[PDB]
Design a protein around this ligand. Structure first.
Ligand code: OHG
Length: 305
């Protein structure tokens, strides 16, 4: 139908501190979760079945991300490292050392030969997956880096920061192509490219999501109604059914907007703390949501539309 009807199907318990991130594997079979409890957990995407715990970080994890082939994970930790993991063996393949403060955010490129990271040390680093070596350190921002993401062909990186900027980087050279958002404030708490790489979705800590045209550097859409003044809350393009924007909220709800009309089309109730992370299944109309330490659960929601 014209609106979704997401309904709670499973609650996934086991983390002992706040959940920080949830991500579906590109092949759709898994959900990965990261937590302040220093653990990664792997769950069945369709039935929430607990699969395994992946351990090794010495402090909390703020983010986890899948390789394009669903075989590897990368995690970003307060221990100042990222780790590359073989999901099947659960083994740490590489530890990526160089950041001088907490690593907050990470992603593979589509090729999955590179990892990008953002840190409280105000830098963005680009890493070689095969060797675990740091290829480039970008002096990207003047405050902690909240998000990093590659576009569809891997040629661009978008970064965001508490400094109030969103910057687009040439992967190959590390050089800045554009400062897309250029304000002293508000802090930019999240950014990512649209699936086709033409748009950037940006969150600011003034309860606002905006959809930007990268090429023209202009705001096309604004989404409001939710609460976001403190946390770096993920947002998503939902593309399997109707074309939605999805975000967590500091009022403990998942918000779903019509991307084109900007109308709120659903609010998902059930969590008992801030919903810091949401993920959209690559093929099925399924949302994963995760909450902070009063809750510590992941919820799987399913829609007909
Ligand atoms: C908690 C968290 N938010 C982000 C957004 O990039 C990374 N980790």
């Amino acid at each position: 139908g014209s609106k979704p009807n997401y309904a709670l199907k499973f609650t996934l318990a086991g983390h002992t501190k706040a959940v920080s991130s949830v991500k579906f594997s590109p092949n759709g079979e898994w959900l990965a979760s990261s937590s302040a409890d220093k653990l990664i957990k792997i769950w069945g995407a369709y039935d929430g079945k607990f699969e395994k715990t992946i351990s090794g970080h010495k402090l909390g994890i703020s983010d986890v991300a899948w390789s394009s082939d669903s075989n590897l994970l990368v995690s970003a930790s307060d221990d100042k490292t990222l780790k590359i993991w073989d999901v099947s063996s659960g083994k740490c393949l590489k530890t990526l050392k160089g950041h001088s403060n907490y690593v907050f955010c990470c992603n593979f490129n589509p090729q999955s030969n590179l990892i990008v990271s953002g840190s409280f040390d105000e830098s963005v680093r680009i890493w070689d997956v095969k060797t675990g070596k740091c290829l480039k350190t970008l002096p990207a921002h003047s405050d902690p880096v909240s998000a990093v993401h590659f576009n569809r062909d891997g040629s661009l990186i978008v970064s965001s920061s508490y400094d109030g900027l969103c910057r687009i980087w040439d992967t190959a050279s590390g050089q800045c192509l554009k400062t897309l958002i250029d304000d002293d404030n508000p802090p930019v708490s999240f950014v990512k490219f649209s699936p086709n790489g033409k748009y950037i979705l940006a969150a600011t800590l003034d309860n606002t999501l905006k959809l930007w045209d990268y090429s023209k550097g202009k705001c096309l859409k604004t989404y409001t109604g939710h609460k976001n003044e403190k946390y770096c809350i993920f947002a998503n393009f939902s593309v399997t059914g109707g074309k939605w924007i999805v975000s967590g909220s500091e009022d403990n709800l998942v918000y779903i907007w019509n991307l084109q009309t900007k109308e709120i089309v659903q609010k998902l109730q059930g969590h008992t703390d801030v919903v810091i992370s949401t993920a959209c299944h690559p093929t099925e109309n399924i949302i994963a949501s995760a909450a902070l330490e009063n809750d510590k659960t992941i919820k799987l929601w399913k829609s007909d539309c």
